[PDB]
Amino acid sequence: SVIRWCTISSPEEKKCNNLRDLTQQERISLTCVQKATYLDCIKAIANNEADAISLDGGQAFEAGLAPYKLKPIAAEVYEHTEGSTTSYYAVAVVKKGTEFTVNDLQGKTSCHTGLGRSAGWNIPIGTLLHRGAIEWEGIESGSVEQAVAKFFSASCVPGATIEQKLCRQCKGDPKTKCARNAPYSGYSGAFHCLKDGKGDVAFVKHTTVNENAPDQKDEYELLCLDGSRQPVDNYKTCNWARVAAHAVVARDDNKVEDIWSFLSKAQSDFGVDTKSDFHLFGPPGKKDPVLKDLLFKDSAIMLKRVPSLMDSQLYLGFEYYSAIQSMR
Ligand SMILES: [Fe+3]
């Protein structure tokens, strides 16, 4: 019996084969299918051409719509003060000194993890809109990118389609610079994007600074929704939202057990406590954003199985869910 994972980048593939390689000796075994975009994975998965992929809540949302109707099989666990939780916080990071508040955000540059991802988009944009900041009336008259491209001087937003302003700060080969897996894509990419000065703001996770710049953590602060700017380590108070962990998405069939089995074991032999050269998660550390969050976030510490009961909606929450919807 084999599970076929869908990978979305070469390096992600490798890590994948890696684990398949040192796993081929079990009841359930791996195999890596590499697609172009997560969409194609979602699709293959539904077509029986694959069986799993771990997605950001923004994509989990997507993966749940019809025709797919994929379910969140397992969700990532993250360090909490209280040991652990299945959620993370969305924060907007900023360099220390550059005075400026949430309100003074117009005509700025900004870096985002990618189009429609929780932290780098859904939360921030919808927030900005829910605040009278961004002018958006609706789908049937104006796109969202457009309202976005109208608010910021320019941006980096991997996945962007409708506006070159949004692809303005993306560093890399122009062919692929705004690719969904571009060098400036992902939590860490959006950080570099900030690091490198290509944007005045980064929309990332509460772990973001530590994982790329624990050394120069002092060099950054957080933009709070109230007006303040707090210290990188104050995400709790200075946050824009608390979102659901990324989840592993799979067809609603009988296989969901083979997958959980596979994951349960693998995580057993290669967790944060593994003693192997091979790590399922991370580990976290200043590395090249390109090699980050492969398969799973570098910041995941465990996997917690999801109750069969939950679909995408129940998983995300009626609130977040409506919020995402209302944006498309
Ligand atoms: Fe995320």
Short mmCIF file of all heavy atoms in Angstrom, two decimals, residues 265-297:
data_model
loop_
_atom_site.label_atom_id
_atom_site.label_comp_id
_atom_site.label_asym_id
_atom_site.label_seq_id
_atom_site.Cartn_x
_atom_site.Cartn_y
_atom_site.Cartn_z
N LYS A 265 3.43 7.35 11.85
CA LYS A 265 4.67 6.65 12.02
C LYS A 265 5.83 7.52 11.69
O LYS A 265 6.76 7.63 12.49
CB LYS A 265 4.73 5.44 11.11
CG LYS A 265 5.42 4.25 11.75
CD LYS A 265 6.92 4.22 11.57
CE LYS A 265 7.41 2.77 11.56
NZ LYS A 265 8.79 2.62 12.02
N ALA A 266 5.77 8.08 10.48
CA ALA A 266 6.85 8.91 10.00
C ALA A 266 7.14 9.99 10.98
O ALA A 266 8.26 10.33 11.26
CB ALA A 266 6.51 9.51 8.67
N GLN A 267 6.10 10.57 11.52
CA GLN A 267 6.40 11.62 12.43
C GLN A 267 7.01 11.07 13.68
O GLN A 267 7.78 11.75 14.34
CB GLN A 267 5.23 12.57 12.68
CG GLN A 267 4.04 11.87 13.33
CD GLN A 267 3.24 12.85 14.12
OE1 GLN A 267 3.61 14.02 14.20
NE2 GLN A 267 2.18 12.37 14.75
N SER A 268 6.69 9.80 13.98
CA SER A 268 7.25 9.07 15.13
C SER A 268 8.76 8.90 15.02
O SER A 268 9.52 9.31 15.90
CB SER A 268 6.62 7.72 15.33
OG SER A 268 6.34 7.56 16.72
N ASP A 269 9.20 8.37 13.89
CA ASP A 269 10.62 8.18 13.57
C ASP A 269 11.38 9.46 13.20
O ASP A 269 12.59 9.49 13.26
CB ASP A 269 10.80 7.18 12.40
CG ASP A 269 9.98 5.92 12.50
OD1 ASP A 269 9.89 5.45 13.73
OD2 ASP A 269 9.45 5.39 11.53
N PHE A 270 10.70 10.52 12.75
CA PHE A 270 11.44 11.70 12.32
C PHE A 270 10.94 13.01 12.80
O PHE A 270 11.11 14.00 12.10
CB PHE A 270 11.50 11.84 10.80
CG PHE A 270 11.85 10.56 10.08
CD1 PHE A 270 10.91 9.92 9.28
CD2 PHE A 270 13.12 10.01 10.18
CE1 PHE A 270 11.21 8.75 8.59
CE2 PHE A 270 13.45 8.84 9.51
CZ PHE A 270 12.50 8.21 8.71
N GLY A 271 10.36 13.06 14.00
CA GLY A 271 9.84 14.31 14.52
C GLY A 271 10.94 15.27 14.96
O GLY A 271 12.12 15.18 14.60
N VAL A 272 10.52 16.23 15.73
CA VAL A 272 11.46 17.17 16.23
C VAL A 272 12.43 16.45 17.16
O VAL A 272 13.37 17.05 17.63
CB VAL A 272 10.71 18.23 17.01
CG1 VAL A 272 9.72 18.95 16.09
CG2 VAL A 272 9.97 17.53 18.14
N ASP A 273 12.17 15.18 17.46
CA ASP A 273 13.03 14.49 18.39
C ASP A 273 13.77 13.39 17.73
O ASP A 273 14.44 12.60 18.38
CB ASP A 273 12.25 13.88 19.58
CG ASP A 273 11.33 12.78 19.12
OD1 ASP A 273 10.96 12.97 17.86
OD2 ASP A 273 10.98 11.84 19.82
N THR A 274 13.61 13.35 16.44
CA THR A 274 14.26 12.31 15.71
C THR A 274 15.72 12.36 15.97
O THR A 274 16.24 13.37 16.46
CB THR A 274 14.10 12.53 14.22
OG1 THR A 274 14.76 11.46 13.54
CG2 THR A 274 14.77 13.87 13.92
N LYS A 275 16.35 11.26 15.65
CA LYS A 275 17.77 11.12 15.79
C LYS A 275 18.35 10.75 14.43
O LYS A 275 19.46 10.21 14.31
CB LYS A 275 18.08 10.08 16.85
CG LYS A 275 17.78 8.66 16.38
CD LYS A 275 17.56 7.67 17.52
CE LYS A 275 17.52 6.22 17.03
NZ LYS A 275 17.70 6.07 15.56
N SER A 276 17.57 11.03 13.37
CA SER A 276 18.00 10.71 12.02
C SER A 276 18.55 11.93 11.28
O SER A 276 18.42 13.05 11.75
CB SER A 276 16.87 10.10 11.24
OG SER A 276 17.15 10.29 9.88
N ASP A 277 19.21 11.75 10.14
CA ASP A 277 19.72 12.96 9.49
C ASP A 277 18.57 13.74 8.91
O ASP A 277 18.63 14.97 8.78
CB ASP A 277 20.82 12.72 8.44
CG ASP A 277 20.44 11.73 7.38
OD1 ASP A 277 20.22 10.51 7.86
OD2 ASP A 277 20.37 12.04 6.19
N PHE A 278 17.53 12.95 8.59
CA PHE A 278 16.27 13.35 8.00
C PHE A 278 15.27 13.80 9.06
O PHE A 278 14.99 13.03 9.98
CB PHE A 278 15.62 12.18 7.21
CG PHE A 278 14.28 12.60 6.62
CD1 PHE A 278 14.27 13.27 5.40
CD2 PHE A 278 13.07 12.42 7.28
CE1 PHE A 278 13.08 13.74 4.83
CE2 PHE A 278 11.87 12.87 6.72
CZ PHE A 278 11.88 13.53 5.49
N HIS A 279 14.74 15.03 8.85
CA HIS A 279 13.73 15.74 9.65
C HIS A 279 12.47 15.96 8.85
O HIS A 279 12.55 16.43 7.72
CB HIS A 279 14.23 17.14 10.07
CG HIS A 279 15.11 17.09 11.26
ND1 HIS A 279 16.38 16.49 11.21
CD2 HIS A 279 14.88 17.49 12.54
CE1 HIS A 279 16.88 16.55 12.43
NE2 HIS A 279 16.01 17.15 13.25
N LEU A 280 11.31 15.68 9.43
CA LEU A 280 10.03 15.91 8.77
C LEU A 280 9.70 17.40 8.84
O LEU A 280 9.17 17.98 7.89
CB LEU A 280 8.90 15.13 9.48
CG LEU A 280 7.70 14.84 8.60
CD1 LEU A 280 8.18 14.29 7.27
CD2 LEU A 280 6.82 13.82 9.29
N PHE A 281 10.06 18.01 10.00
CA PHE A 281 9.82 19.41 10.23
C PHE A 281 11.07 20.18 10.47
O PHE A 281 11.73 20.01 11.47
CB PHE A 281 8.91 19.67 11.44
CG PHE A 281 7.83 18.64 11.69
CD1 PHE A 281 7.84 17.87 12.85
CD2 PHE A 281 6.77 18.46 10.79
CE1 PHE A 281 6.83 16.96 13.12
CE2 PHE A 281 5.76 17.53 11.03
CZ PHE A 281 5.80 16.76 12.20
N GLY A 282 11.33 21.10 9.58
CA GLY A 282 12.45 21.98 9.70
C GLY A 282 13.76 21.29 9.39
O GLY A 282 13.88 20.61 8.37
N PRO A 283 14.70 21.51 10.28
CA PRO A 283 14.35 22.32 11.41
C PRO A 283 14.39 23.77 11.04
O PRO A 283 14.82 24.12 9.94
CB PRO A 283 15.39 22.03 12.48
CG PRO A 283 16.30 20.95 11.95
CD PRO A 283 15.99 20.81 10.48
N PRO A 284 13.88 24.60 11.92
CA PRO A 284 13.90 25.99 11.61
C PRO A 284 15.30 26.54 11.78
O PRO A 284 16.07 26.06 12.61
CB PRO A 284 12.96 26.68 12.60
CG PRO A 284 12.35 25.60 13.47
CD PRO A 284 12.92 24.28 13.01
N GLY A 285 15.61 27.57 10.98
CA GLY A 285 16.89 28.26 11.05
C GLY A 285 17.22 29.04 9.80
O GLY A 285 16.78 28.66 8.73
N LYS A 286 18.00 30.11 9.96
CA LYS A 286 18.39 30.89 8.80
C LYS A 286 19.02 29.97 7.81
O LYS A 286 20.08 29.42 8.03
CB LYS A 286 19.29 32.07 9.11
CG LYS A 286 19.15 32.54 10.55
CD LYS A 286 20.47 32.97 11.18
CE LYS A 286 21.23 33.98 10.34
NZ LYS A 286 20.61 35.31 10.33
N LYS A 287 18.24 29.79 6.76
CA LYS A 287 18.44 28.94 5.59
C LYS A 287 17.96 29.77 4.38
O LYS A 287 17.59 30.95 4.54
CB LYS A 287 17.52 27.72 5.80
CG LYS A 287 18.03 26.33 5.46
CD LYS A 287 16.90 25.40 5.03
CE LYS A 287 16.76 24.11 5.84
NZ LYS A 287 15.62 23.27 5.42
N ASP A 288 17.93 29.19 3.20
CA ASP A 288 17.44 29.92 2.09
C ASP A 288 15.95 29.63 1.94
O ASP A 288 15.59 28.50 1.68
CB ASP A 288 18.28 29.60 0.84
CG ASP A 288 17.74 30.13 -0.45
OD1 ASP A 288 16.54 30.22 -0.71
OD2 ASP A 288 18.68 30.47 -1.29
N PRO A 289 15.13 30.69 2.08
CA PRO A 289 13.67 30.66 1.98
C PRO A 289 13.15 29.63 0.99
O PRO A 289 12.12 28.99 1.20
CB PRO A 289 13.25 32.05 1.53
CG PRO A 289 14.46 32.95 1.72
CD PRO A 289 15.65 32.07 2.05
N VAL A 290 13.92 29.44 -0.04
CA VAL A 290 13.59 28.45 -1.01
C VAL A 290 13.53 27.05 -0.35
O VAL A 290 12.65 26.25 -0.64
CB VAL A 290 14.51 28.53 -2.25
CG1 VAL A 290 14.71 27.20 -2.95
CG2 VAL A 290 13.95 29.57 -3.22
N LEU A 291 14.42 26.74 0.57
CA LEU A 291 14.40 25.42 1.21
C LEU A 291 13.59 25.37 2.50
O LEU A 291 13.82 24.50 3.35
CB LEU A 291 15.80 24.92 1.57
CG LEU A 291 16.90 25.52 0.75
CD1 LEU A 291 18.06 25.76 1.67
CD2 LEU A 291 17.26 24.47 -0.29
N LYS A 292 12.72 26.31 2.67
CA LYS A 292 11.98 26.38 3.89
C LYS A 292 10.60 25.84 3.70
O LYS A 292 10.06 25.86 2.60
CB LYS A 292 11.87 27.82 4.36
CG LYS A 292 13.19 28.47 4.74
CD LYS A 292 13.22 28.83 6.21
CE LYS A 292 14.06 30.05 6.51
NZ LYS A 292 14.46 30.17 7.92
N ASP A 293 10.04 25.41 4.81
CA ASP A 293 8.69 24.93 4.80
C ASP A 293 8.44 23.90 3.72
O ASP A 293 7.43 23.98 3.03
CB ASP A 293 7.73 26.14 4.63
CG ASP A 293 7.95 27.18 5.68
OD1 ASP A 293 8.03 26.61 6.85
OD2 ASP A 293 8.08 28.41 5.47
N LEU A 294 9.36 22.97 3.53
CA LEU A 294 9.19 21.94 2.54
C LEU A 294 8.35 20.87 3.17
O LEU A 294 8.56 20.56 4.35
CB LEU A 294 10.54 21.39 2.04
CG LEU A 294 11.28 22.34 1.07
CD1 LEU A 294 10.50 23.62 0.81
CD2 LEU A 294 12.70 22.68 1.53
N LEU A 295 7.35 20.36 2.40
CA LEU A 295 6.41 19.34 2.89
C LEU A 295 5.46 19.87 3.97
O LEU A 295 4.25 19.73 3.92
CB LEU A 295 7.15 18.16 3.51
CG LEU A 295 7.72 17.19 2.50
CD1 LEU A 295 7.69 15.80 3.12
CD2 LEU A 295 6.92 17.25 1.19
N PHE A 296 6.06 20.43 4.99
CA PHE A 296 5.37 21.02 6.12
C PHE A 296 6.13 22.27 6.58
O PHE A 296 7.31 22.51 6.23
CB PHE A 296 5.23 20.04 7.33
CG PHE A 296 4.75 18.66 6.95
CD1 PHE A 296 5.63 17.67 6.51
CD2 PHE A 296 3.39 18.36 6.97
CE1 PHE A 296 5.16 16.41 6.16
CE2 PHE A 296 2.90 17.12 6.58
CZ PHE A 296 3.79 16.12 6.18
N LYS A 297 5.48 23.06 7.40
CA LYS A 297 6.20 24.21 7.88
C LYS A 297 7.31 23.71 8.78
O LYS A 297 7.19 22.69 9.47
CB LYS A 297 5.34 25.25 8.58
CG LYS A 297 4.35 25.92 7.66
CD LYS A 297 3.12 26.53 8.37
CE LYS A 297 3.45 27.68 9.31
NZ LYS A 297 2.25 28.17 9.99
#
